[PDB]
Design a protein around this ligand. Structure first.
Ligand SMILES: CC(C)n1nc(-c2ccc3cc(OCc4cccc(Cl)c4)ccc3c2)c2c(N)ncnc21
Length: 459
């Protein structure tokens, strides 16, 4: 018989959303081993390769081991989902650790890039390509100041098709190698993406940029960049030589990962060096902007999902209510919430019967409903969904506060232009919505920003 994911693992909490799906902190029910499970929904993600090829890749990945590559433990598949069970890392995204520190030098950058290049080198020796290497795929193993970088998502893009949805796409255009856009690509695309990351580490600005996603892609495809910005005066010639070699347009002429490890810059700076204060400043601004744009898109998506699920759940309970008096018991609420997860593949958190029992009890405990009697289901629906809406609203607010680093309480019109450009929300469209919200002003507070987002998702 086929092994079942939830026979072995219980969900602890959600770690986050990554490429191809949600990631849940899980725990082995016998051994206590904790793990990070990427859950891919088959309805939402199409496979590029056949079953035979995916299984073979899994079997290889399980046997690979390198300090700078996520360890894969197990793999499960059922009717609706893939469950990718990996080692859990607790140090967060690299760029989030970098913006916290007060000093950052070419020595710190070289030590980071050496780690990325070692991991890439190992995977290329094993004929595995990333293709979607970006700052978000560089996690720190733990919270220790010295901790190793673990690259996540190697091999996924070979087997599954990327989302076309901006909420998933955001951030990708800066890093993608030109040859990936045109269709003929190989392992050298990973060196390009690393070159882009290095350019950003040392100046705090992407080498290929523009006012929206297509304008970025246009700049990537042309392939031209310069080091004429002021903060490149601080930087060694050898770093720029390595960057040039990694951002070489024709992949056969581009440096390999392994050869990049032997480059003068890596050799000097990882065995007197000033801090790159302007770079840290610009990275903090870059990161903040990207995180608010993402948070804006997830808020909009979560509002749409709620409109969908609120009405669906009501229809399920109405159907279940035999004599139509509006009263269901707890086991019926559980069954209906299960029917919702059957129709919707959204909550990776809720793909196990006991998880749903627990979530229903949390809702009943909020509403002051007794769980052993019959319950007004319409009120259960309101609370279960108001809980989600509140949680989403709080999620967005924290990201607004993070972005507003001067504690002004406001985002200016220029800043909105940048955020919505990153979010790929059309310029005349957000300006139009800003006009219906701002009837005075050139700046918005949090409530106003939130109102604009509601108007940009048909509310
Ligand atoms: C950033 C956060 C949401 N996240 N994501 C992950 C994460 C990211 C990618 C993962 C990829 C995984 O499997 C890759 C795989 C599995 C089978 C076949 C192929 Cl080709 C590739 C498994 C777990 C993963 C887990 C993660 C983690 N391991 N530790 C801490 N936080 C993590």
């Amino acid at each position: 018989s086929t092994a079942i994911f939830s026979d072995r693992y219980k969900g602890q909490r959600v770690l986050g959303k990554g490429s191809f799906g949600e990631v849940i902190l899980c725990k082995d029910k016998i051994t206590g081993q904790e793990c990070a499970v990427k859950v891919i929904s088959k309805r939402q993600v199409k496979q590029k390769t056949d079953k035979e090829s995916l299984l073979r890749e899994v079997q290889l990945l399980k046997q690979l081991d390198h300090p700078n590559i996520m360890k894969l433990y197990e793999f499960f598949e059922d009717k609706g989902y893939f469950y990718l069970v990996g080692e859990v890392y607790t140090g967060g995204e690299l760029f989030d650790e970098i913006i916290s520190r007060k000093r950052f030098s070419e020595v710190d950058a070289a030590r980071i890039i050496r780690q990325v290049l070692s991991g890439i080198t190992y995977m290329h020796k094993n004929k595995i390509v990333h293709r979607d290497l970006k700052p978000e795929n560089l996690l720190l193993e733990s919270k220790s100041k010295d901790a190793n970088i673990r690259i996540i998502d190697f091999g996924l893009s070979t087997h599954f098709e990327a989302s076309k949805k901006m909420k998933d796409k955001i951030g990708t255009a800066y890093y993608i190698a030109p040859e990936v856009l045109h269709g003929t690509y190989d392992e050298k695309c990973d060196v390009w993406s690393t070159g882009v990351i290095l350019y950003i580490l040392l100046s705090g600005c992407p080498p290929f940029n523009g006012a929206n996603e297509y304008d970025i892609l246009k700049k990537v495809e042309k392939g031209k960049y310069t080091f004429e910005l002021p903060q490149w005066k601080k930087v060694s010639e050898s770093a720029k030589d390595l960057i040039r070699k990694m951002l070489t347009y024709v992949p056969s002429m581009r440096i390999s990962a392994r050869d990049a490890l032997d480059h003068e810059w890596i050799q000097t700076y990882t065995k007197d060096v000033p801090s790159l204060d302007n770079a840290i400043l610009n990275i903090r601004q870059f990161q903040g902007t990207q995180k608010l744009a993402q948070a804006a898109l997830l808020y909009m998506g979560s509002k749409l999902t709620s409109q969908d699920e609120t009405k669906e759940l009501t229809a399920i309970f109405h159907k279940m209510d035999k004599n139509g008096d509006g009263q269901l018991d707890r086991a019926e609420l559980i069954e209906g919430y299960k029917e919702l997860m059957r129709m919707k593949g959204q909550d990776a958190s809720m793909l196990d019967a006991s998880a749903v029992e627990h979530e229903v009890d949390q809702v009943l405990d909020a509403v002051d409903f007794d769980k052993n009697g019959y319950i007004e289901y319409s009120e259960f629906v309101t609370v279960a969904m108001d809980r989600k809406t509140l949680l989403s609203r709080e999620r967005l607010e924290r990201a607004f506060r993070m972005f507003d680093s001067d504690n002004s309480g406001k985002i200016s019109s220029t800043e909105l232009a940048t955020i919505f450009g990153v979010s790929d929300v059309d310029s005349e469209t957000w300006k139009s919505v800003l006009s219906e919200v701002d009837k005075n002003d050139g700046e918005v507070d949090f409530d106003e920003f939130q109102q604009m987002l509601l108007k940009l998702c048909g509310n």
